[PDB]
């Protein structure tokens, strides 16, 4: 039991660090300065979710 | 992708199929913890990392190449 609980703890700490970073980043998003490139709509690489399967 | 290989008039069949998929997600969510339907839809539409998605890009393509040069308006019936 304890081994996997410890693994969960590690994962939770990593996710907490990431969430703190993301929150401080999101608080300073600028909409008026936001610029979107019409020309680069498809040459951009699409986001893909994880597909791990045991 | 099935929308992308059809004319502009198939948008209705598209949103019908999307509603079926949303109902399926709602049913399966009663037991499984899936990604939100919005997240899944945006991932499938390439609308996460980019401003516009595939559906709007194909809408514009269809407009330009098939709608403006091939259709006739009727004022009374609209």
Swiss-Prot record, chain A:
It comes from the Eukaryota. It is found in: Cytoplasm, Cytoskeleton; Synapse; Cell junction, Focal adhesion. Phosphorylated on tyrosine residues by ABL1 and dephosphorylated by PTPN12. Highly expressed in brain. Lowly expressed in testis, ovary, colon, kidney, pancreas, thymus, small intestine and peripheral blood. Component of the WAVE1 complex composed of ABI2, CYFIP1 or CYFIP2, BRK1, NCKAP1 and WASF1/WAVE1. Within the complex, a heterodimer containing NCKAP1 and CYFIP1 interacts with a heterotrimer formed by WAVE1, ABI2 and BRK1. CYFIP2 binds to activated RAC1 which causes the complex to dissociate, releasing activated WASF1. The complex can also be activated by NCK1. Binds actin and the Arp2/3 complex. Interacts with BAIAP2. Interacts with SHANK3; the interaction mediates the association of SHANK3 with the WAVE1 complex. Interacts with ABI1 (via N-terminus). It is linked to Neurodevelopmental disorder with absent language and variable seizures: A disorder characterized by neurodevelopmental abnormalities, including moderate to profound intellectual disability, with autistic features, seizures, severe impairments in speech, and gross motor delay. Downstream effector molecule involved in the transmission of signals from tyrosine kinase receptors and small GTPases to the actin cytoskeleton. Promotes formation of actin filaments. Part of the WAVE complex that regulates lamellipodia formation. The WAVE complex regulates actin filament reorganization via its interaction with the Arp2/3 complex. As component of the WAVE1 complex, required for BDNF-NTRK2 endocytic trafficking and signaling from early endosomes. Also involved in the regulation of mitochondrial dynamics. Belongs to the SCAR/WAVE family. This is Actin-binding protein WASF1. The gene is WASF1.
Curated annotation (Swiss-Prot), chain B:
It is found in: Cytoplasm; Cytoplasm, Perinuclear region; Cell projection, Lamellipodium; Cell projection, Ruffle. Changing residue 57 to A: Constitutive induction of the formation of actin filaments. It comes from the Eukaryota. Component of the WAVE1 complex composed of ABI2, CYFIP1 or CYFIP2, BRK1, NCKAP1 and WASF1/WAVE1. Within the complex, a heterodimer containing NCKAP1 and CYFIP1 interacts with a heterotrimer formed by WAVE1, ABI2 and BRK1. Component of the CYFIP1-EIF4E-FMR1 complex which is composed of CYFIP, EIF4E and FMR1. Interacts with FMR1 but does not bind to related proteins FXR1 or FXR2. Interaction with EIF4E stimulates FMR1 binding. Component of the WAVE2 complex composed of ABI1, CYFIP1/SRA1, NCKAP1/NAP1 (NCKAP1l/HEM1 in hematopoietic cells) and WASF2/WAVE2. Belongs to the CYFIP family. Component of the CYFIP1-EIF4E-FMR1 complex which binds to the mRNA cap and mediates translational repression. In the CYFIP1-EIF4E-FMR1 complex this subunit is an adapter between EIF4E and FMR1. Promotes the translation repression activity of FMR1 in brain probably by mediating its association with EIF4E and mRNA. Regulates formation of membrane ruffles and lamellipodia. Plays a role in axon outgrowth. Binds to F-actin but not to RNA. Part of the WAVE complex that regulates actin filament reorganization via its interaction with the Arp2/3 complex. Breakpoint hotspot for the Prader-Willi/Angelman syndromes and may be implicated in autism. Commonly altered in tumors. This is Cytoplasmic FMR1-interacting protein 1. It comes from Homo sapiens (Human).
């Amino acid at each position: 039991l304890f081994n996997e609980a410890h693994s969960f703890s590690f994962r939770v700490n990593s996710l907490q660090e990431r969430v703190d970073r993301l929150s401080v980043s999101v608080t300073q998003l600028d909409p008026k300065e936001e610029e979107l490139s019409l020309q680069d709509i498809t040459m951009r690489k699409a986001f893909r979710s994880s597909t791990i399967q045991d | 992708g099935r929308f992308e290989s059809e004319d502009l008039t198939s948008i209705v069949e598209l949103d019908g199929l999307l509603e079926i998929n949303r109902m399926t997600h709602k049913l399966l969510s009663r037991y499984l913890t899936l990604d939100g339907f919005d997240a899944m839809f945006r991932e499938a539409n390439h609308n996460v990392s980019a401003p516009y998605g595939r559906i709007t890009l194909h809408v514009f393509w269809e407009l330009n190449y098939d709608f403006l040069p091939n259709y006739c308006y009727n004022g009374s019936t609209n």
